[PDB]
Design a protein around this ligand. Structure first.
Ligand SMILES: CCc1nnc(NCc2ccc3[nH]ccc3c2)s1
Length: 220
């Protein structure tokens, strides 16, 4: 399949990303508290449900939440402010809480069942969110004596995610805080705006995009 792209809601950020976040790829977004990385996740979970003419992929979403940062009311607000039915939008986000790093890995393994079920339907899974990729690994694997095993498990988790992205034409979007991922770093800008910086992309130039966080989620 040709690579599909999901608009972030921000024209500036889309331009930096070559059009939006890509299917068949993992986009990994870093930021401290209030950076906007989870707001971007929420916005993408709405945008992907739009038709391609409006920046979506007519897709369903699967969402893995490690720290209780998913806000259904925020989905509803973004959806309604973009003209979608808020209840329909929520029905097409399959939510799972991950309680620890092992459970997080099992959820990605067992997400393939729903992906397969939806694959040839009107709403195939097009976005798989892991917010956040590392919170449980960081909590559970303390010290340099634990680093080797932490990295091995995380590498296998990322491999599982890459396989789903490539085999089923899904955009994987993960959050992180400071491995074949496209890495975007968010920071506070001036006047309450946020800045995204793209770093180390093999085939996209580094650059920055300024965006806002509004009732529509993220936009210029
Ligand atoms: C590990 C035990 C399971 N618990 N739930 C499962 N399958 C159902 C399910 C529902 C929504 C989901 N969003 C992301 C993954 C996902 C999965 S398998």
């Amino acid at each position: 399949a040709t690579i599909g792209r999901i608009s972030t809601g921000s024209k500036s950020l889309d331009k930096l990303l070559g059009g939006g976040i890509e299917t068949q790829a993992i986009t990994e977004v870093f930021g401290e508290f209030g950076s906007g990385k989870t707001q971007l996740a929420h916005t993408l979970a709405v945008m992907v449900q739009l038709p391609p003419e409006e920046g979506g992929l007519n897709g369903s979403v699967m969402w893995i939440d490690t720290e209780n940062t998913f806000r259904p009311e925020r989905i509803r607000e973004i959806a309604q402010n973009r003209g979608l039915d808020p209840d329909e939008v929520l029905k097409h986000i399959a939510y799972a809480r991950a309680f620890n790093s092992n459970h997080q890995m099992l959820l990605v393994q067992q997400a393939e069942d729903m992906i397969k079920e939806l694959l040839n339907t009107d709403r195939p899974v097009k976005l798989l969110i892991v917010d956040s990729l590392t919170s449980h690994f960081r909590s559970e694997y303390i010290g340099r004596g634990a680093l080797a095993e932490r990295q091995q498990k995380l590498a296998k988790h990322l491999a599982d995610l890459h396989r789903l992205a490539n085999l089923y034409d899904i955009a994987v979007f993960v959050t992180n805080q400071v491995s074949a991922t496209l890495r975007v770093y968010l920071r506070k800008g001036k006047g309450g705006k946020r800045i995204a910086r793209l770093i180390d992309a093999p085939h996209l130039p580094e650059g920055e995009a300024v965006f806002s966080i509004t009732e529509k989620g993220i936009e210029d």
